[PDB]
Amino acid sequence: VFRLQKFIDEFRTYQAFMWALYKYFISFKEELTEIEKCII
Amino acid sequence: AIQINFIKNMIEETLDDFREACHRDIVNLQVEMIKQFHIQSSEIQMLLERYSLNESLVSEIEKLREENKRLRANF
């Protein structure tokens, strides 16, 4: 996950593949707040 | 002249490390001096309280004073 993040920097084919990885990340951060509410 | 100034400048690099190791050693040494005096001072303070007088005796002078006074505060 740290490696996958290291690819995120700020052609388009290669940018839209990086953004498909990151669009997929907000659904893993969506889970992060689920499991964060059980433990708090 | 050239080699003399090369040897000179390296010897100084090494002597700086050595000076500072010795300097630190006096700081550590001063700590050891004072910490031992502090233990001892503490042993003595306690011992002179015990052997120089009877704690026993002073606490019985107060007791007889408390009893005698109270008896007299009913006369």
């Binding site: - | 490390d17 000076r19 001063q30 004072i34």
Partner: protein
Amino acid sequence: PNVLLQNLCCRILGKGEADVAQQFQYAVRVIGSNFAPTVERDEFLVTEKIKKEFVRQRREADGALFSELHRKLQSQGVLKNRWSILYLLLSLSEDPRKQPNKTSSFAAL
């Protein structure tokens, strides 16, 4: 000075506000013995000890950075008390290799 030296005794131990009495009185005694130093002032000489030390511990990059930080430091405000500050950080300098043995097993002695 008393409120400041004391607060140091509480913080370092992270606990105790009169349970640090022993350490306070001790700090006061130590400070009450008159040390004399090897070199008093000169910004360049203390800065140099810190540079050589950097090289010696293999933190060469950081040593490079420290020089930028030193110059920066003067510009955020000029210090009259720098030699002493820069020394204190010097004496607390450590090497990135090795541990100092155990000091959490040393208490039991």
